[PDB]
Amino acid sequence: SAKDERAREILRGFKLNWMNLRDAETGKILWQGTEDLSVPGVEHEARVPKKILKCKAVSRELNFSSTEQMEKFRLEQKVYFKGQCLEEWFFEFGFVIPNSTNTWQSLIEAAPESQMMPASVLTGNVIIETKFFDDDLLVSTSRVRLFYV
Amino acid sequence: SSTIC
Ligand SMILES: *C/C=C(\C)CC/C=C(\C)CCC=C(C)C
């Protein structure tokens, strides 16, 4: 398919360079991944400090490079807990210049305290499924298992 | 918003 070949071109040219999760109230980086978590067909793992569950909001800063242009780069992320979808997150970056490196910052706000899930319940049981799109074209689907430490 | 983040 024309569309499959293009998706593959974009992916071959795409990578996540680094990513921070920063406490938006203190400024402190709590977690910094340097692995390319866009890579599909393998389960990635991430260990995050459990005190991230106490933040009122987190700044997620993602640095990525793309050889190909994208008209409307966006993400859909699902949070699966023991295979149940609990949450769905949507983020839009927009136009990506060909051969560019870009930092994308987004604020993820905590739910009310009474709805937050405990670390000991979550750890090892959460999968984040990320679909990377250019508008309606699915470029990659990646999976990351989270451990809260 | 999130119950895990
Ligand atoms: C506070 C947010 C948490 C606990 C999880 C955020 C997502 C990851 C860490 C890993 C997946 C992220 C991408 C593939 C962009």
Author numbering:
A (entry chain A): 2 to 150
B (entry chain C): 640 to 644
List passages from the publication reporting this PDB structure:
PDE6δ was shown to bind prenylated peptides or proteins of the Ras subfamily with approximately micromolar affinity and to play a critical role in their cellular distribution. INPP5E belongs to the inositol polyphosphate 5′-phosphatase family that hydrolyzes the 5′-phosphate of phosphatidylinositols and localizes to primary cilia. INPP5E contains a C-terminal CaaX motif where the C-terminal residue Cys644 is farnesylated. For certain membrane-associated, post-translationally modified proteins carrying an N-terminal myristoyl or a C-terminal prenyl motif, it has been shown that the import into cilia is dependent on the carrier proteins PDE6δ, UNC119a and UNC119b and on Arl3 as displacement factor.
The proteins show a hydrophobic cavity, where the farnesyl moieties of INPP5E and Rheb are inserted (upper). The prenyl groups overlay well and make an identical interaction pattern with the surrounding hydrophobic residues of PDE6δ (lower). However, the side chains of the residues on the −1 and −3 positions upstream of the farnesylated cysteine (the 0 position) in INPP5E and Rheb show different contacts with PDE6δ. As shown in Fig. 4b (upper), the serine side chain of Rheb on the −1 position makes a hydrogen bond with the side chain of glutamic acid (Glu88) from PDE6δ, whereas the hydrophobic side chain of the isoleucine of INPP5E at the equivalent position is situated in a highly hydrophobic environment mediated by five hydrophobic residues of PDE6δ (Val80, Trp90, Met118, Leu123 and Ile128). On the other hand, the lysine side chain of Rheb at the −3 position is pointing away from the binding pocket of PDE6δ, while the serine side chain of INPP5E at the equivalent position makes a hydrogen bond with the side chain of glutamic acid (Glu88) (lower). Hence, we used a fluorescently labelled C-terminal farnesylated and carboxy-methylated peptide of INPP5E (residues 637–644) and Rheb (residues 175–181) to measure the affinity to PDE6δ by fluorescence polarization. Analysis of the data with a competition model derived from the law of mass action as described shows that the affinities to PDE6δ can be reversed, with a Kd values of (697±54 nM,±indicates s.d., n=14) for INPP5E(KS) and (12±2.7 nM,±indicates s.d., n=12) for Rheb(SI). Structural analysis revealed that the residues at the −1 and −3 positions relative to the farnesylated cysteine are the determinants for the binding affinity to PDE6δ.
